[PDB]
Amino acid sequence: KVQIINKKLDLSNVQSKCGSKDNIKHVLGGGSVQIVYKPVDLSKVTSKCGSLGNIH
Amino acid sequence: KVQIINKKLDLSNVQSKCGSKDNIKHVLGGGSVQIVYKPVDLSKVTSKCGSLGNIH
Amino acid sequence: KVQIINKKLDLSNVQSKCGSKDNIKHVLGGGSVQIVYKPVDLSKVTSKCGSLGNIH
């Protein structure tokens, strides 16, 4: 048995000039909030040159 | 048995000049909020040159 | 047995000049909110040149 009372709460976003990259920004749960954040990442930024040559 | 009462809550977005990339921004759940965030990523940015040559 | 009462809630978007890329922006659930966010990504940005040559 649980009994919760959420009265007069404030979760308010006000922005003027803002660039963002935000995943889970504003979340409100009545009785519970579970968050599982497991991002995998296998990325590559490669550059391959064979026999480069620079001459003045 | 659960008993919840969500009265007078505020989740309000107000923006003026804002660029964003936001996945899960404003979420409100009556009794529970589960979030599973598991993005996979296998990306490539490659560049391959064989026998580059620069001469003045 | 569950008993929830969501009275006078506020989830309001007000924007003036805003560019965005937002996936799950404003979501309200009566009793529960489940979110499974599992985007896969196998992208390529490649460039291949064989025997480049620059001469002044």
Residue numbers in the entry:
A (entry chain B), B (entry chain A), C (entry chain C): 274 to 329
From the reporting publication:
Tau amyloid accumulation is a prevalent pathological feature observed in various neurodegenerative diseases such as Alzheimer’s disease (AD), corticobasal degeneration (CBD), globular glial tauopathy (GGT), familial frontotemporal lobar degeneration (FTLD), chronic traumatic encephalopathy (CTE), Pick’s disease (PiD), argyrophilic grain disease (AGD), and progressive supranuclear palsy (PSP), collectively termed tauopathies. In these diseases, Tau amyloid fibrils accumulate intracellularly, leading to an array of pathological outcomes, from prion-like propagation and protein homeostasis disruption to enhanced neuroinflammatory response. Importantly, recent cryo-electron microscopy (cryo-EM) studies have revealed that Tau exhibits unique amyloid fibril structures in the brains of patients across different tauopathies, correlating with specific disease variants. Our research uncovers that the widely used rTg4510 mouse model expressing FTLD-associated human P301L mutant Tau, develops amyloid fibrils whose structure is notably different from those in human brains diagnosed with non-hereditary tauopathies.
After helical reconstruction, we obtained a three dimentional (3D) density map with an overall resolution of 3.3 Å. The fibril comprises a single protofilament with a crossover distance of ~633 Å. The fibril core encompasses residues 274–329 (residue numbering based on the 2N4R Tau), which include the C-terminal lysine of R1, the entire R2 and 24 amino acids of the succeeding R3. This structure contains seven β-strands (β1–7), organized into a serpentine fold. Two elongated strip-like densities in the shape of peptide constituents, termed Islands A and B, are also evident. Island A aligns against R3, and connects with densities of R2 proximate to K290; Island B aligns against R3 as well on the other side, connecting with densities proximate to K321. In contrast, the structure of the human P301L mutant Tau fibrils extracted from the rTg4510 mouse markedly diverges from these Tau folds. Yet, when overlayed with the five ex vivo 4R Tau fibril structures, including GPT, GGT, AGD, CBD and PSP folds, a part of the P301L Tau (residues 297–311) that displays a U-shape, exhibits a similar structure to them. By comparing the P301L structure with the GPT structure, it is observed that the P301L mutation introduces a bulky hydrophobic side chain of Leu, which leads to steric hindrance against the interactions with H362 and P364 as seen in the GPT fold and preventing the attachment the C-terminal segment (residues 359–379) to the U-shaped motif. Instead, the P301L mutation establishes pronounced hydrophobic interactions with L282 and L284, which together with hydrogen bonding between the side chains of residues 286–299, attract the N-terminal segment (residues 274–299) to the U-shaped motif forming in the unique P301L fold.
